[PDB]
């Protein structure tokens, strides 16, 4: 279990097979038009065909922009990357604004890579070479194979390797009675330690007296690892390793870290294309969600032209809040949603509506249901009535403190008295604004 | 393999003839004849390459194919000539100055190519033998025409052992450096397969002479030489743009060395293109730098694009056309793109839905052209795919008028959005 947050109740866009909404499917109520619209863009994501497509969720605050923006994330499931960022995260000390944008852009493109690996392990009981006829003149002792016997908790089996493994085995310095690891395709021998059946009884040694392996001597499995392109980029930019004194940039943390196209494109898109066209990996192009996009700079908005016009881009959901508003970083240029007209020409706009009282009663009920509150129909109606006067979010937020008053007062559910009490302990924005307007 | 269709995937280059005559809708580009012909002229001068630092500004309305023309030039120019595309706002770094960023953008679009003949041994390993002692051994190699045998020195034995190569591998030896590179398994490289091992990675073995002489080209951008000479770390060239290159005896020193290589013929200089999109984002300091960066003999041609006309320049309160000072504007040839005719709009939509692999009815084309002529072309391009998804959700075969009308109702176009913004949200 985990703590309840603002959007813990939304579990999907709530769409039936024709792509409509009944009235309140999967934790969202109302907004049928907007939920249908981003129902289309969910399938735009699932088809994996388009790049850099962008949609702007535009409406008043509290009209579910964030809610259905991440209901999209619920519809897509955890398989595809859904990368959230707020419009204020772009301003950074270490790295240029547009570089944050590029990092986030290909942080939203996933790559899930499937690879079987197959392994042999066990306590090694036999280690005998196999002599053969002299390949050339009479030196004797021509080793053609080497027999190695491995024991696990399942059974004991003997195995023939070619002599190169005899050399590697000796160079790994394994002994009879310890536990090894052999990787069939690659050919490695790794000593994972003397077998615990030869127990540490008075040995204090730190080298692992490793328990006898469970399961078969031979075991294979398809490892399935999903990485974002940004993970590959970062791992190539500042790599690990105990050598190459540059790798001892280890006291230092990592400023200056704007990644380079030569690497980004020239060295890292080729390997992804290779793995994809080889049958090793699948691209999972995801979503980049930018809420409060109005906080971006004019330089950022203009960079998004180029970024959204790329073939190697996710689809981008923007959410905005402001009216016709001054673009940040400009000298008094006013434009809709605080976003330059130039970028608005590039986004399909989804309009979110302001709720009716009925819809607000439904949302209040769902939020009470989610936070674990029991609420009487009278208290629910009163929350609805005081929530028609002020914002939905305040109406919803009164639930938990009112429930605490109920619990203190010994009640099992919110009686109307408690919502009345809380609505006088705490104010909303509008009431407080009136107080401030009265007193100086 | 997976580089999804973006906004510009459909244009495979400028649809020009052998006489720089633009076709109406050939090679993915539609209409826009005059500006496309101008782009062809400057593309041919890019290819000829004998003039440095010439500058072109593609001006025009928002949406009238400026970026389409630029990427058409990029696609028609092809690889092996540097085309560096940059947004004007990319040069505002925290790690380096505006002018270092612009120098690096310029230099990243000049290539230096060193072309060298070298002799290799290419063959299928028939045997390798090697003794511990000053270890010593022999190697026998085959090509479809012949075989031969080599005695191996200690360093060669070491490098062969470092790759674990064996019979049946098909390999190259660079006679000058001795690095082995197994291209794969010859059909005689099959293991005994009495137990598990390496997979069946088979490939054909080589033909002709066992030892042969062939050409290798080492191409690096001027920024790339510059970076890797800057300081001994140098993997900077991949790490990040962490720079601030010292002008002192790196610009002049690289220029003199590359000019000497050009003159004595060791290297060929391949000047490319720097495309600055949304160049109006540059600072008056940036334009001031461009003035004299253009006036150089290691300067590529740079192309620029801008949507805006009479408006103040960034970093000051000076009005000017295109938002560029008439100082830099005097170094340029200006190519202005025109708005689209109804038939050009219809034909762009036709090509664009062909790229997106969606069928539409002619009435759907009619209404969508009407939409993209009343509102804006980009919106009509965005309705293609949305209507396609609406269509496929009803299991339709092709996009019909009702699909486009529905999805038009479903998404807004910044005109209807501003009209609906009559609610005073957070002004």
């Amino acid at each position: 279990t985990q703590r309840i947050a603002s959007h813990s109740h939304v579990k999907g866009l709530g769409l039936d097979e024709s792509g409509l909404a009944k009235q309140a499917a999967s934790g969202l109520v109302g907004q049928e038009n907007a939920r249908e619209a981003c129902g289309v863009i969910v399938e735009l994501i699932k088809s994996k065909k388009m790049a850099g497509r962008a949609v702007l969720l535009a409406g008043p605050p509290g009209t579910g922009k964030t809610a259905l923006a991440l209901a999209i994330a619920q519809e897509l499931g955890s398989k595809v990357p859904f990368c959230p960022m707020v419009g204020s995260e772009v301003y950074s000390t270490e790295i240029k604004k547009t570089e944050v944008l590029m990092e986030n852009f290909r942080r939203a493109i996933g790559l899930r890579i499937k690879e079987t690996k197959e392994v042999y392990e066990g306590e090694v009981t036999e280690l005998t070479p196999c002599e053969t006829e002299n390949p050339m003149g009479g030196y004797g002792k021509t080793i053609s194979h080497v027999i190695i016997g491995l024991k696990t908790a399942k059974g004991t089996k003997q195995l023939k390797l070619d002599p190169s493994i005899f050399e590697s085995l000796q160079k790994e310095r394994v002994e009879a009675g310890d536990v090894i690891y052999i990787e069939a395709n690659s050919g490695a021998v790794k000593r994972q330690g003397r077998c615990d059946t030869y127990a540490t009884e008075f040995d204090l040694e730190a080298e692992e007296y490793v328990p006898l392996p469970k399961g078969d001597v031979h075991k294979k499995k398809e490892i399935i690892q999903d990485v974002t392109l940004h993970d590959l980029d970062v791992a190539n930019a500042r790599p690990q390793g105990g050598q190459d004194i540059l790798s001892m940039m280890g006291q230092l943390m990592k400023p200056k870290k704007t990644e380079i196209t030569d690497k980004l494109r020239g060295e890292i898109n080729k390997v992804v294309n290779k793995y994809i066209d080889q049958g090793i990996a699948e691209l999972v192009p995801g979503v980049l969600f930018v809420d409060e996009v109005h906080m971006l700079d004019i330089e950022c908005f203009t960079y998004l032209h180029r970024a959204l016009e790329s073939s190697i881009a996710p689809i981008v959901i923007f959410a905005s809040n402001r009216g016709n508003c001054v673009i940040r970083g400009t000298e008094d240029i006013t434009s809709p949603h605080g976003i330059p007209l130039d970028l608005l020409d590039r986004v399909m706009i989804i309009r979110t509506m302001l709720y009716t009282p009925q819809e607000m009663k439904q949302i209040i009920k769902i939020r009470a249901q989610t936070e674990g509150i029991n609420i009487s129909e009278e208290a629910l109606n009163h929350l609805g009535e005081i929530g028609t006067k002020t914002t939905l979010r305040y109406s919803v937020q009164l639930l938990t403190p009112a429930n605490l008053l109920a619990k203190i007062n010994g009640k099992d559910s919110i009686e109307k008295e408690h919502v009345e009490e809380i609505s006088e302990l705490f104010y909303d924005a509008k009431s407080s604004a009136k107080i401030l307007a009265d007193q100086q | 393999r997976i580089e999804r269709i973006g906004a510009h995937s459909h244009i495979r280059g400028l649809g020009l003839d052998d006489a720089l005559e633009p076709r109406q809708a050939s090679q993915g580009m539609v209409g826009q004849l005059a500006a496309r012909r101008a782009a062809g002229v400057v593309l041919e001068m890019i290819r000829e390459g004998k003039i440095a630092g010439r500058a072109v500004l593609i001006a025009g309305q928002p949406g009238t194919g400026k970026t389409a023309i630029a990427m058409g030039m990029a696609q028609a120019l092809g690889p092996d000539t540097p085309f560096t595309a940059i947004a004007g706002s990319e040069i505002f770094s925290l790690e380096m100055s505006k002018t270092e960023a612009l120098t690096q953008a310029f230099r990243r679009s000049i290539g230096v190519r060193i072309k060298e003949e070298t002799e290799i041994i290419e063959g299928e390993v028939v045997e390798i033998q090697i003794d511990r002692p000053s270890k010593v051994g022999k190697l026998t190699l085959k090509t479809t025409e012949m075989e031969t045998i080599y005695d191996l020195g200690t360093k060669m034995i070491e490098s062969l052992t470092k790759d674990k190569v064996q019979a049946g591998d098909v390999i190259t030896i660079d006679k000058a450096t001795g690095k082995i590179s197994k291209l794969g398994r010859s059909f005689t490289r099959a293991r005994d397969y009495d137990a598990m091992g390496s997979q069946t990675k088979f490939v054909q073995c080589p033909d002709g002479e066992l030892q042969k002489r062939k050409e290798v080209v080492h191409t690096v951008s001027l920024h790339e030489i510059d970076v890797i000479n800057s300081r001994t770390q140098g993997f900077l060239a991949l790490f990040s743009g962490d720079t601030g290159e010292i002008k002192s005896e790196v610009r002049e020193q690289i220029n003199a060395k590359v000019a000497e290589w050009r003159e004595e013929g060791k290297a060929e200089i391949i000047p490319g293109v720097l495309f600055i999109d949304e160049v109006h984002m540059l600072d008056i300091e940036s334009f001031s730098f461009l003035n004299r960066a253009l006036e150089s003999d290691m300067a590529p041609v740079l192309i620029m694009a801008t949507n805006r006309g009479i408006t103040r320049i960034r970093g000051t309160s000076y009005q000017s056309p295109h938002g560029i000072p008439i100082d830099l504007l005097d170094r340029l040839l200006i190519v202005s793109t025109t708005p689209y005719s109804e038939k050009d709009t219809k034909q762009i939509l036709r090509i664009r839905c062909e790229e997106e692999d969606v069928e539409m009815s002619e009435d759907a084309y009619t209404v969508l052209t009407r939409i993209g002529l009343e509102t804006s072309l980009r919106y009509a391009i965005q309705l293609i795919t949305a209507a396609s998804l609406v269509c496929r959700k009803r299991k339709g075969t092709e996009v019909q008028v009702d699909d486009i009308k529905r999805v038009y109702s479903l998404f807004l176009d910044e005109s209807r959005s501003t009209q609906y913004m009559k609610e005073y949200q957070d002004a």
């Binding site: 390949p135 030196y139 002599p163 | 033998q129 002692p133 064996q166 019979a167 049946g168 005689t188």
Partner: peptide, 13 residues
């Protein structure tokens, strides 16, 4: 001393 020899050979391929 020890003259340990490694062969790898294209046998009947």
């Amino acid at each position: 001393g020890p003259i340990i020899t490694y062969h790898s050979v294209t046998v009947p391929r």
